[PDB]
Design a protein around this ligand. Structure first.
Ligand code: F5S
Length: 214
């Protein structure tokens, strides 16, 4: 169903090319944020749905939200949602994996100069993160599993989370931004991008800003 079956061994070189392709094809780099919000919206839909039959699934994190937390000190942009979350197996599948179907369609679409604006539907959207970031940490907690951290920059690694604060449920993406892409820690820019590709989202998109007072 996906490239290299599922397993990812001695294939760091591929991540560079996909990153190089996506960095060359997508000159408007703000679309990484649109894909994050779209991923988070889908995650919230799934837990809301399965909470209709079994409302006890919402007790881990009662509220359903998307939250963007720019960390100016650490040069990190954090995007958290309270969706269904990801087990260890789910993290390995969704993160860093390529689908032969999507890539073949993506590559072929590039050949004919066809509309590739919607990156998510080629199963390749993961590497849009590397448009703005040099490293990525994914913290996730699924009701049926413990909290795990997936991170790469590349070598993939899923580590049991024994340090970060506890998420009730859901996923947090920590983006270590490139030195030229720090514009995405600023409030104005974030609202600009969110306002663009977020009209149709049914969940609140919250922005946490720390400003000094005069
Ligand atoms: C910035 O661009 C990209 C980042 C990562 C990827 C590859 O990970 N793909 C994802 C798929 C999301 C689509 C539907 C989901 O409801 C299912 C729950 C679970 C499977 O998904 C998530 O928890 C989740 C999230 O809450 C939040 C996320 O940001 C991602 C993801 C994980 C692709 C693009």
């Amino acid at each position: 169903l996906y490239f290299q079956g599922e397993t990812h061994e001695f294939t760091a070189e591929i991540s560079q090319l996909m990153s190089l392709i996506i960095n060359t094809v997508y000159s408007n780099k703000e679309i990484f944020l649109r894909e994050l919000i779209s991923n988070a919206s889908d995650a919230l839909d799934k837990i809301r749905y399965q909470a209709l039959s079994d409302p006890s699934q919402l007790e881990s994190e009662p509220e359903l939200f998307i939250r963007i937390i720019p960390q100016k000190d650490q040069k990190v942009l954090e995007i958290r949602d309270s969706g269904i979350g990801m087990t260890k197996a789910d993290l390995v599948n969704n993160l860093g994996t390529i689908a032969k179907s999507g890539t073949k369609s993506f590559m072929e679409a590039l050949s004919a100069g066809a509309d590739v604006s919607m990156i998510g539907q080629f199963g390749v959207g993961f590497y849009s993160l590397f448009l703005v970031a040099d490293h990525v940490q994914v913290i996730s907690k699924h009701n049926d599993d413990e909290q795990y951290v997936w991170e790469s920059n590349g070598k993939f690694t899923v580590t049991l989370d024994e340090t970060n604060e506890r998420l009730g449920r859901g996923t947090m993406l920590r983006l270590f931004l490139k030195e030229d892409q720090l514009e995405y820690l600023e409030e104005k820019r974030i609202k600009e991008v969110v306002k663009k590709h977020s009209e149709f989202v049914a969940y609140p998109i919250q922005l946490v800003v720390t400003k000094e007072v005069e």
